Amino acid sequence: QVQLVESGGGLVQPGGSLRLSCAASGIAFSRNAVGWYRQAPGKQRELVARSNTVGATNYADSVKGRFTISRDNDKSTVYLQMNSLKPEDTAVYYCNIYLYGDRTGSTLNSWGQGTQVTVS
Amino acid sequence: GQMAYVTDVKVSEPTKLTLTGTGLDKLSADDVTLEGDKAVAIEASTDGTSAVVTLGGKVAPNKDLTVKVKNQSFVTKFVYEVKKLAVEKLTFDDDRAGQAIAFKLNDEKGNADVEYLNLANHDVKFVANNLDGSPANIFEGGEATSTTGKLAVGIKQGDYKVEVQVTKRGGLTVSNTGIITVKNLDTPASAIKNVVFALDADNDGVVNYGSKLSGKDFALNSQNLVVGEKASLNKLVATIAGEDKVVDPGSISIKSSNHGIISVVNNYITAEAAGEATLTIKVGDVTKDVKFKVTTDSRKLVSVKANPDKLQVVQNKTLPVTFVTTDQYGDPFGANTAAIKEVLPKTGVVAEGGLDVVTTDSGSIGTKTIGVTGNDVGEGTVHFQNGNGATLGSLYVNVTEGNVAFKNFELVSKVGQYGQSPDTKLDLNVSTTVEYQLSKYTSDRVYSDPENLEGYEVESKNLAVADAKIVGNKVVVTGKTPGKVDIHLTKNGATAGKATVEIVQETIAIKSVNFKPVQTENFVEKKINIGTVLELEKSNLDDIVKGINLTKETQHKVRVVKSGAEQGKLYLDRNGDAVFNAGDVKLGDVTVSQTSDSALPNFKADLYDTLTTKYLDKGTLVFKVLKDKDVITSEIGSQAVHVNVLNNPNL
Amino acid sequence: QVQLVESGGGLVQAGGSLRLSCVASGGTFSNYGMGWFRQAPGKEREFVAAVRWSGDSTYYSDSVKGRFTISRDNAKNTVYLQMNGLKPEDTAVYYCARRLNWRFISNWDKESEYAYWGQGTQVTV
Ligand SMILES: [Ca+2]
Ligand SMILES: [Ca+2]
Ligand SMILES: [Ca+2]
């Protein structure tokens, strides 16, 4: 059974950093690329960052340089270092597998509750 | 660079591309990129006309993928077409969680992922059946059908026929059948001995089991955790069929009596909050309760102990001292250079910068053997202090004057024990080698250092019992067969050392064989085989043999190899898996032959299909149990089967 | 054990129609698949049609596809086969068979997947 546990969201002031964590289960973690997705209020869901099975990363041009994704196969966990947070990153952040060809994670069936990131 | 030309790109599997073209043997994984990610592996054919490219992830079917190979670009789509299916002939436990029916699709390596198949618009249905065709309630929830393949915890033992049906949503169904076995995989333990927990000290989620720990990890001596720490087993010893062994981690279960104090996930424990909790460790049907305490006091270095704690060393010579560094709980503590201040005595027995107790080596946290060199002659005590000047321990050092008055041939295990005999017993089951050295002693009988063996020679006076060679400054004696052997160390034909080593090797063997009472076969259609002369307990794999009396007591079963080139090999099945492998002991061989006067045209040397009597078979089959089938004189016992099919009168 | 009594075979002409039934008696008829098989005098056993335990999927022999139609009635535990445009080349003893396995669908044409068999009704075109 798929389990996705997000944490690390906060009510931090502008310019601050947030260490986003994700404890995953039932998603063949080591055999899949993982990634962080975000959804603004009244806006579409987009892939912010992804890390393939060997640690090779990809980012949306909107978050390049400011975001760095990491994964740990031993703990089946995904991390997202949120450096220099701009208001335009207002969204609930979700962690999930990344399937090549999908891009927005629209084909996935199970999602967690996410972690709210609020930058004033 | 090399011309590599791709004529076709196809996604053949969720994680792999198949390229067609020329010179594909000259492509590296880095040359191929799918949706922005370079491939992780590439395996071209020998002619370079095709290549399998492994991607760093799974692909979503029916989605446009851009694949780039050097300057070439392709747009493809994965159309997952399930054409065939294979259900694995697996064996499961009658009471174990996390078990699922495995199956493979098409020619894929590795098991199909039902969750991935669901995301790939394919539904999966599992149907369990008893061999007689009736439904079998083996799936989760005591059920005969499943959509996941997960098995229930509490299955009635036996054999089952399971069908897996994979259907494309709004398309066709592909299905196949398979036979699974529900056995008692469980470790048949009678007792739990040593339970060794190890701290995941570097918080990396990895705690090695059955091998040396890695990183900062250390084996706990105590049953104390600090809040926030994590731990896991490094080993658990249980008594299985009369022998103590390191149990397979897959057979261990760990439960906490208070989840708010210590919580457990797959035998990995987390100290949640201060207080007490009992961990119940279960192996098979035997349990051990381990009472742990979770404190709020971080591990601090409190003790530095030396073995030996009183060192007598000759001036300018080096001797080993083993240092054990420990915390307030008596657990290993990794001490770096700054953790211990080695306060040297003013008599100068140890030189400035001559002793730094560093105990941070992976696999050996808290313990390190360091050489201590005798500096100025005299006596003094090194005091081990922390930053605040508290004394964590001490080492007394007596530096002695040097000369050489004696050279004694000694066991390396008894180095520096003046007058100890070099004679020893070497058991080949524990060790195959024994090491010696020529130890130098002062005129005051103080062990100095080993003699340089340049120019010396060593000889075994019985090459069949053991070999002996000079490796550096040691004599390495290698034991081959039981018996007593003299080892002689010489220089230019003068004796420098002699030692007698008794080599022993006890190995369980067949003492005698009790065959079944046999009668003359007067009728047709009677099958004759190994079971006619030896009492067998039938198995699906290698059968158990009764009546094979051994030279030693054992709870392990004697089996005979059922088929293949090694058919008839008798062995002690030390791991109990009904297959000859790992540390099983070969006990002998069962053979069959027909006597010289026999008239048995359908005779076969096969132990399981030796003869089926037919009209006018007349002869004698001789079944033998030998220690080795290649040495006819190694026969332990035999039993003949007399064949005389009656067909009278016969005008 | 479950027994299969088939009835509906006679002497039809070239291009006619014939309906044959198979009544079973034992356990739950709706949990096992049904299959119609035939054997011409002098030849080996050949599969003609199969119905899934749950209906909604029928299988037809490549030589008889389009002509015959297999159907089932779990209420009256009987196997049916509507033969349309019967030709002389399919003159054989039509035996009937019930699957051994509960809710299995794979290998509908293999003889190994059927434990119960009928004596077969003669259909001569
Ligand atoms: Ca670790
Ligand atoms: Ca130090
Ligand atoms: Ca074995």
Residue numbers in the entry:
A (entry chain B): 1 to 120
B (entry chain A): 212 to 862
C (entry chain C): 1 to 125
Reported in the publication:
While most organisms only contain a single SLP, the S-layer of B. anthracis is dynamic in its composition, presenting two mutually exclusive S-layers made of surface array protein (Sap) or extractable antigen 1 (EA1) appearing at the cell surface during exponential and stationary growth phases, respectively. The remaining part of the protein (214–862) forms the assembly domains (AD) or “crystallization domain,” responsible and sufficient for self-assembly of the S-layer lattice. The EA1 assembly domain consists of 6 immunoglobulin-like domains, where three calcium-binding sites structure interdomain contacts that allow monomers to adopt their assembly-competent conformation. Nanobody-induced depolymerization of EA1 S-layers results in surface defects, membrane blebbing and cell lysis under hypotonic conditions, indicating that S-layers provide additional mechanical stability to the cell wall.
The combination of Nb643 and Nb632 gave rise to plate-shaped crystals that diffracted to 1.81 Å resolution. The crystal structure revealed that the EA1AD consists of six distinct Ig-like domains (D1–D6) connected by short linkers. Domains D3-D6 lie in a single plane and arrange into a flat “body,” forming a circular interdomain arrangement with a central cavity of 45 Å diameter. D1 and D2 arrange in a 54.5° angle and form a two-domain “arm” that is connected via a flexible linker (residues 394–400) to the D3-D6 EA1AD body. Nb643 and Nb632 bind the hinge between D1 and D2, and the exposed face of the D2 β-sheet, respectively. Interestingly, the X-ray structure of EA1 presents strong electron density and plausible coordination chemistry for three candidate calcium ions, located in D3, D4 and D6. Strikingly, all three calcium-binding sites encompass loop regions located in an interdomain interface, i.e., IL-1 in D3–D4, IL-2 and IL-3 in D4–D3 and IL-4 in D6–D3. The crystal packing shows the presence of stacked planes of EA1AD protomers related by translational vectors a = 74.3 Å, b = 87.7 Å and γ = 107.8°, values identical to those that we measured on single reconstituted S-layers imaged by cryo-electron microscopy. The EA1AD X-ray lattice captures two out of four contact zones (i.e., (iii) and (iv)), providing atomic detail of the binding surfaces. In the X-ray structure of EA1AD, binding of Nb632 positions D2 out of plane of the D3-D6 body, and overlaps with its binding interface with D5BR in the S-layer, providing a structure-based explanation on the S-layer depolymerizing activity of Nb632, and highlighting the importance of the D2 contact for EA1 lattice maintenance.
